C-alpha cells in the first residue's frame, strides 16, 4: 500500500532527496524538459500517451511540452515539501495519482521515469545513492497506481 | 487570448502579487484549505464539481480535500515564479487550463475564486490593492477558458 511505501522514506533517504533537489529544483524549466526528452528518447513507446503535446522532439521550443515539464517539476517540489508529514505526503501522492490512473498509466509504466531521473541526477554529479533515494519516492506513487 | 490578459500584469501588479504570496504561500496547507472551504461556503453550487473529494464538510480533516488544496497552491506558486517571462507564464497557464476546460468549467465559473482569494488575503491584512492584483492573475487563466 501507499502507506507502507511512504514508511520506506527513512531519515537519510529524505536528506538525500532534499540535498539533490536543492540543485535539480534550481532550474525547473531546464531540468524539467531534460527529464521529459530523456524519457521520450530512452522509452520511445511512452510518446503515445503524450499526443496532446505534439511534436515532442522540438524540446524547449514546444510550448505545450515546456508547460507540461515545468508543471511536473512543481509536483516534485510538492512532494519534497511534504516529506516532514507522511499524512500530507500520502494525500498529495494520491491526488496526482488520480489523473494518471484515469490515463491508464500503470505502476510499471510510471516506473519508466527512474531512468531519466538517474541521468539528470548524474549530470549534476549525484550518483547511485541519490538515484536510489528518488526511486523510493517514485515507488510511493507507484503504490497508488 | 492569454498573452493580452498577461499584458495586464504590469510591474506594480507583479510586485503586489509576489509580496502577498510571500505570506500566503508560506502556509500552503492552511491557506489552500481556507480558499476551498471559503469557495464552498460562499458559492455552494461549486461543490457540484467536487464530488470526488467526498465530505467537504470535514475541511482540513478530509484527506482528499487537503490533497487537492495543497496541490492548488503549487499551481499558484508556479504562476508567481513565471511572472517575469510571459512566454513561460502563458504556456503554464494553458497547461492548467486544459483540465478545467475538460471539466466544462467556464471563465465565469472559474472567476468565483476571486471572492475567496480576497477574504484569505484580508485575513493576512492585505487590502483591496492586493485583491485587485490577484483578480488580474486569475483573469489570465480566464482568458484561456
Ligand atoms: C516523477 C514522475 C511524474 C510526475 C511527478 C508526474 C506529474 C504529472 C503532472 C503534475 C501532470 C499534470 C497534471 C495532470 O494533467 O494530471 C502530469 C500529466 C501527465 N502525465 Fe505524469 N508525471 C510523472 C510521470 C509520468 C510518466 C512516466 C508518464 C507516462 C508513462 C506520465 C504520463 C502523463 C500524461 C499522459 C500526462 C498528460 C499530458 C498532457 O496531455 O498534457 N507521467 N503528470
Ligand atoms: C486559483 C484558481 C485555481 C487554480 C490555481 C486551480 C488549480 C487546480 C489544480 C492544480 C488542479 C489539480 C490538477 C488537475 O486535475 O487539473 C485542479 C483541479 C480541479 N479544479 Fe481547479 N483551480 C482553480 C480554481 C478552480 C475553480 C474555481 C473550480 C471550480 C468552480 C475548479 C475546479 C476544479 C476541479 C473540479 C478539479 C478536480 C478536483 C478533483 O476532483 O480532484 N478549479 N485545479
Structural domains in chain A, sorted by start? 1-145 (1.10.490.10)
C-alpha cell at A55: 511534436
C-alpha cell at A60: 524547449
C-alpha cell at A26: 534550481
Give the single-character DSSP code of A59: G
Q: How far apart are CA B1 and CA A131, in angstroms?
A: 41
B118-136 burial, b at 16+ Cβ within 10 Å, e below that, comes to bbbbeeeebeeebbebbbb
Contact of B114 with B132, CB cutoff 8 Å: no
Q: Helix, strand or coil for residue A25?
A: coil
Is the C-beta atom of A74 inside 6 A of ligand 1?
A: no
**A68 has binding-site annotation:** no
**Considering only CB atoms, which residues of chain B are within 8 Å of chain A?**
28-29, 52, 63-64, 66-68, 70-71, 74-75, 77-78, 81-82, 87-88, 90-92, 94-96, 98-99
CA dihedral angle for residue B65, residue B71, residue B72, residue B76, rounded to 10 degrees: 160
Cell numbers 507502507 correspond to what residue?
A4
- Give the chain A residue whose CA is nearest to the CA of B73: A78
CA-nearest residue, atom 8 of ligand 2: B72
Distances (CA, A) of A138 to A115, A135, B9, B130: 11, 5, 37, 38
Cα angle for residues A139, A85, B25 (degrees, 5° grid): 105
Is the C-beta atom of B31 inside 6 A of ligand 2?
A: no
Is the C-beta atom of A64 inside 6 A of ligand 1?
A: no
Q: CA gyration radius for chain B?
A: 15
Q: How far apart are CA A129 and CA B144, in angstroms?
A: 43
Cell numbers 473529494 correspond to what residue?
B53
Cα angle for residues B56, B145, B67 (degrees, 5° grid): 30
Q: How far apart are CA A20 and CA A136, in angstroms?
A: 14
List, as one string, the DSSP characters of A71-112: HHHHHHHHHHHTTT-HHHHHHHHHHHHHHHHHTT--HHHHGG
Distance of CA A139 to the CA centre of its chain: 10
Contact of A130 with A20, CB cutoff 8 Å: yes
Contact of B110 with B142, CB cutoff 8 Å: yes
Give the single-character DSSP code of B27: S
Which residues of chain B lie closer than 8 angstroms to A70, CB-CB? 78, 82, 88, 91-92, 95
The Cα of B68 is separated from the nearest Cα of chain A by a number of Å equal to 6
Other beta carbons within 10 Å of A8: 12
Amino acid at each position: 500500500s501507499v502507506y507502507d511505501a511512504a514508511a520506506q522514506l527513512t531519515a537519510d533517504v529524505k536528506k538525500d532527496l532534499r540535498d539533490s533537489w536543492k540543485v535539480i529544483g534550481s532550474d525547473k524549466k531546464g531540468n524539467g524538459v531534460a527529464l521529459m526528452t530523456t524519457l521520450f528518447a530512452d522509452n520511445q513507446e511512452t510518446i503515445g500517451y503524450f499526443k496532446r503535446l505534439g511534436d515532442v522532439s522540438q524540446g524547449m521550443a514546444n510550448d505545450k511540452l515546456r508547460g507540461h515539464s515545468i508543471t511536473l517539476m512543481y509536483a516534485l517540489q510538492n512532494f519534497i515539501d511534504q516529506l516532514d508529514n507522511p499524512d500530507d505526503l500520502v494525500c498529495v501522492v494520491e491526488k496526482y495519482a488520480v489523473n494518471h490512473i484515469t490515463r491508464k498509466i500503470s505502476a510499471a509504466e510510471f516506473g519508466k521515469i527512474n531512468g531519466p531521473i538517474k541521468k539528470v541526477l548524474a549530470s549534476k554529479n549525484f550518483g547511485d545513492k541519490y538515484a536510489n533515494a528518488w526511486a523510493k519516492l517514485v515507488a510511493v506513487v507507484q503504490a497508488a497506481l
